[PDB]
Amino acid sequence: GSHMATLKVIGVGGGGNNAVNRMIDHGMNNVEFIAINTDGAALNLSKAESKIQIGEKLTRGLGAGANPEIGKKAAEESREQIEDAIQGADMVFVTSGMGGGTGTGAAPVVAKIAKEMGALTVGVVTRPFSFEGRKRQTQAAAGVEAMKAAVDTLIVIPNDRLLDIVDKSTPMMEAFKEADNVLRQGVQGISDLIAVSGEVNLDFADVKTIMSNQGSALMGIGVSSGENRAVEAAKKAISSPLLETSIVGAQGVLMNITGGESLSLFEAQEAADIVQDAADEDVNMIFGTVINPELQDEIVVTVIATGF
Ligand SMILES: Nc1nc2c(ncn2[C@@H]2O[C@H](COP(=O)(O)OP(=O)(O)O)[C@@H](O)[C@H]2O)c(=O)[nH]1
Ligand SMILES: [K+]
Secondary structure, three states: OOOOOOEEEEEEHHHHHHHHHHHHHHOOOOEEEEEEEOOHHHHHOOOOOEEEEOOHHHHOOOOOOOOHHHHHHHHHHOHHHHHHHHOOOOEEEEEEEOOOOHHHHHHHHHHHHHHHOOOEEEEEEEEOOHHHOHHHHHHHHHHHHHHHHHOOEEEEEEHHHHHHOOOOOOOHHHHHHHHHHHHHHHHHHHHHHHHOOOOEOOOHHHHHHHHOOOEEOEEEEEEEOOOOHHHHHHHHHHOOOOOOOOOOOOOEEEEEEEEOOOOOHHHHHHHHHHHHHHHOOOOEEEEEEEEOOOOOOOEEEEEEEEOO
């Protein structure tokens, strides 16, 4: 009868595994985590239930030393181990920091395997800070292009955008958590969509329609209360300052609105218009509604945007 979607989040390389570690700390049920690295010492500290050391013959348990070809060969030589860990997933999020050796080279191989295994495959990757220099940025760009060829949808977070949301004292780790929220809240928004039946119900097949073989994507969530809550939640959903791909130009959108018994038709249209006017395109919308009576004055808008 009913379908149960298996979501897996895969961290590849140092930055991706720290995202996984921090997401596990935050708490994420129903999602399964996989940690993939050449660096055996970092893998030893991973909180992920499923750990895969790749490239031990190539690196002797060290990182890739910024050589993406070593990350790529390490992933290819552990293909069977990667397939075994993914097998059964309906959706896979591959998160990695681009510009080093393991993420840049291995993350596109992991994404390709996930897609070959039948999983809807989303990449969420960072680009390096400009202060890391041009060779790092150029390697990262080759990684991004390789990711884009391997995934169904790709979200790119330029680390330079973190400098737009900090003050001179913000701990680096606090900035990194802001970047993690892009992946965490996207995963959580899909999980929630999949676990609850809506009054206007969207399910994993709608996620597939909007994300499959699409390229660049935006995933966002917004929460507001009071008057203008619908407009404010929709603006929050689509307005992250950390994204390379904004909502502008979107041609397909999956939008789900969750609220209490007070959720009004009028405000549902307001939220939908905010998104479609922001896109500045004729948006093919997949619209859903959930009534959670536990919510009183709160409204949550979830947006997945593709078709750029
Ligand atoms: N936002 C963020 N970026 C990171 C993090 N760790 C590393 N990076 C970035 O990701 C790039 C690659 O670093 P790393 O993942 O350790 O390299 P690799 O393990 O050899 O692939 C760096 O050049 C940084 O720009 C992190 O925790 N958060
Ligand atoms: K549903």
